[PDB]
């Protein structure tokens with residue numbers, strides 16, 4: 003298996019490592035209705051037919067409790083990847099500090 | 101099939117109704133839900149927890165950080 | 181000696197109570213002499229022991245002293261001497277007396293009885309002195325169970341803590357714990373047993389060395405063997421200890437197997453009821469499960485251990501009221517002995533020479549020992565196995581006798597003491613013993629006379645008649661007696677031949693000074709006199725005269741008195757002549773008068 | 774006897790008077806502590822007075838030791854933490870006190886046992902309040918019977934375990950108060966539910 007995350011702006015969204023990024027794009031199409039040809043995806047900070055195994059996505063790297071992540075863009079011209087980071091947690095109470 | 105979850109801070113997440121139903125609160129509420137109190141990081145961690153619970157239901161390897169721990173406890177109390 | 185004379189004075193009438201008081205005071209005053217009395221004794225001791233005796237003064241005159249109370253609190257001196265086996269026993273006698281008295285009473289002595297309670301547990305002996313200690317202690321616990329449990333837990337912990345780790349202390353404490361059994365109430369029993377079980381398991385896990393673990397396990401097994409009531413309420417721990425004993429049966433160290441087997445059979449007797457029952461959550465009566473595990477459990481056990489395990493299983497089977505399930509239990513239970521027995525019988529029908537193998541006869545002897553134990557445990561329901569093996573067993577017995585004769589002809593009876601001959605004779609004796617067991621516990625002596633006894637006589641009577649006194653096994657007579665006891669009535673028609681073939685030969689062996697044969701003859705003759713006195717009179721006139729002569733030899737060496745009772749020509753023949761021999765008499769005087 | 778009682782000297786058994794006091798009563802323990810008895814003295818097997826107190830279930834001695842700075846998770850030569858002994862004997866109260874002091878459940882002794890493992894073994898014997906002790910252990914660990922093993926468990930109890938772990942080796946009942954939590958959740962952290 004390979005559990006994956008995808009992000010774009012404030013918006014967030016698994017397969018087999020043997021699977022390829024195109025079927026993941028098809029999943030993205032079904033979810034958001036932007037066909038794969040108007041989707042482009044980025045592994046790490048790298049703009050991804052590659053099988054998820056050869057994209058670097060591995061189950062040990064892609065567990066459900068620690069899934070992999072991907073950036074997404076659409077043909078608006080594909081926009082520069084815009085992903086808005088999650089809010090940070092507040093200060094840890096001193097009693098809970100190490 | 102799918103369901104959308106909005107964090108209090110406006111971050112947005114999508115899963116299958118399947119996983120979201122792991123929360124009793126989700127089942128009580130149900131296409132989309134906005135949690136005007138759950139921050140983005142907590143909501144993302146909860147999505148991870150749903151996926152992990154599904155993947156190891158009646159399987160077990162779950163990480164937690166102290167900073168998010170209290171928020172996670174309160175949010176779990178909220179979401180069953 | 182001065183003390184002993186005073187002791188005798190104190191040994192002997194409350195009307196002299198003042199004297200009995202003043203004496204006690206003055207001797208107590210003459211404290212002026214006496215401190216570690218145990219030390220003084222250990223390092224003219226006799227004075228201390230005589231001072232202990234005083235013990236019997238208060239056995240009597242504790243009543244007259246109750247009538248100087250601080251001086252009585254003497255009792256401390258009684259403890260001092262108690263610290264000193266003879267002196268300790270002297271003290272223990274009064275301790276038991278006082279404990280029983282105060283217990284059966286329903287305040288003066290209780291404020292310090294705990295001191296004695298501590299003393300008893302400390303000095304507890306291995307299971308008369310032990311009984312007195314046990315009796316005294318159970319009286320004390322009936323005065324307070326709580327303090328007894330507290331003290332036992334304290335010392336058990338000190339052992340667990342390693343503060344006092346010692347085989348001796350462990351053994352004595354466990355002995356006292358076992359002694360308390362029955363005195364405790366069932367709920368307090370449960371609590372205390374749970375505490376002690378956990379503590380013992382703890383010190384078992386903690387301690388290294390298979391020797392230490394072995395002693396701890398033996399103590400645990402003893403204590404559990406002393407508390408069937410708790411085991412019944414905790415059938416879970418009962419199954420637990422059963423499996424643990426199975427484990428110990430596969431041990432090879434310090435005879436643990438034997439010990440385990442011992443423990444096993446004990447509990448097997450005291451809760452047989454429960455094994456034959458489908459207990460809470462059980463798919464089956466647990467006994468059946470054992471009947472399946474047995475093959476494995478015995479794979480490490482020795483023949484005596486096998487006998488003990490079979491006997492316990494037999495008791496448990498006997499607990500099975502349903503004779504159908506009981507038949508199934510017996511079938512499975514004897515199958516392995518039955519299987520080997522069938523193999524031997526098949527080999528015999530292939531060739532008699534199998535019987536002429538020391539190996540074959542030894543296998544048969546093991547089978548017979550197992551069957552004897554099983555019948556002893558089961559009773560009549562064992563009839564199924566008995567009938568299963570009866571005919572081929574008697575054929576084997578006859579073949580054994582034939583081969584005994586075939587050897588004897590070569591050296592006279594001196595073929596005896598040859599190991600094969602010894603084994604064959606032992607096998608015949610055990611066969612007779614098994615027959616005796618079941619027949620004594622037979623349901624229908626008519627059925628026995630129809631199916632069992634006549635073939636037995638065919639195999640036994642004429643053979644014994646033709647045999648030589650050593651091959652003429654005494655047990656035969658015993659068996660016959662038991663037959664007479666059961667087949668009283670039916671047995672009548674067989675009495676003549678029985679005496680024709682056997683009574684003559686044993687009489688030849690009895691008129692001499694074969695003691696077991698002679699004792700069996702006494703009992704068998706009295707049995708014939710009682711059960712079948714009509715047959716007794718019907719004895720042929722020659723054999724009847726020989727019977728009277730045997731009686732004469734006997735009391736010339738109760739049966740005569742029995743004959744006098746029953747017989748009420750004979751008198752003018754024997755009574756007149758026997759009168760001089762005996763010179764009952766009131767009976768004789770009554771008869772003539 | 775508190776009235777009857779170098780205090781920290783290890784005796785011929787290599788143990789302190791405080792060990793005996795712990796095995797006997799909390800009053801003597803308190804008197805010794807007042808006289809400066811070291812709670813963390815290690816005996817001939819490096820079992821603390823806390824270890825024996827926990828085994829004896831002398832809960833009052835346990836609380837007195839812990840309140841005086843006892844080493845909650847000291848490891849003897851067998852490396853059995855006092856929780857390990859308390860669990861292997863299966864007594865409840867002292868186990869609860871240890872859990873409130875944040876004793877570590879997830880531990881392994883040289884024997885290769887966990888305290889919950891030993892408690893489970895005791896329960897299997899049918900001798901076992903012991904069910905409540907098992908319940909406290911389960912709530913403290915959150916997840917470790919088969920269903921409780923195959924079930925990943927609630928996110929809630931996982932968060933509770935993480936929070937307690939963060940609180941560390943201090944008195945949890947007092948610490949949880951400072952947390953900005955409803956009284957219900959503060960109680961939940963203390964495994965009272």
Ligand SMILES: *[C@@H](CC(=O)OC(C)C)n1cnc(-c2ccccc2)n1
Pocket residue numbers: 381384385390393394396397398400401420421424428
């Ligand atoms: C501890 C281990 C043991 O078996 O000791 C020796 C190696 C034989 N032990 C002793 N007795 C027991 C026990 C357990 C369950 C039921 C009865 C006795 N365990």
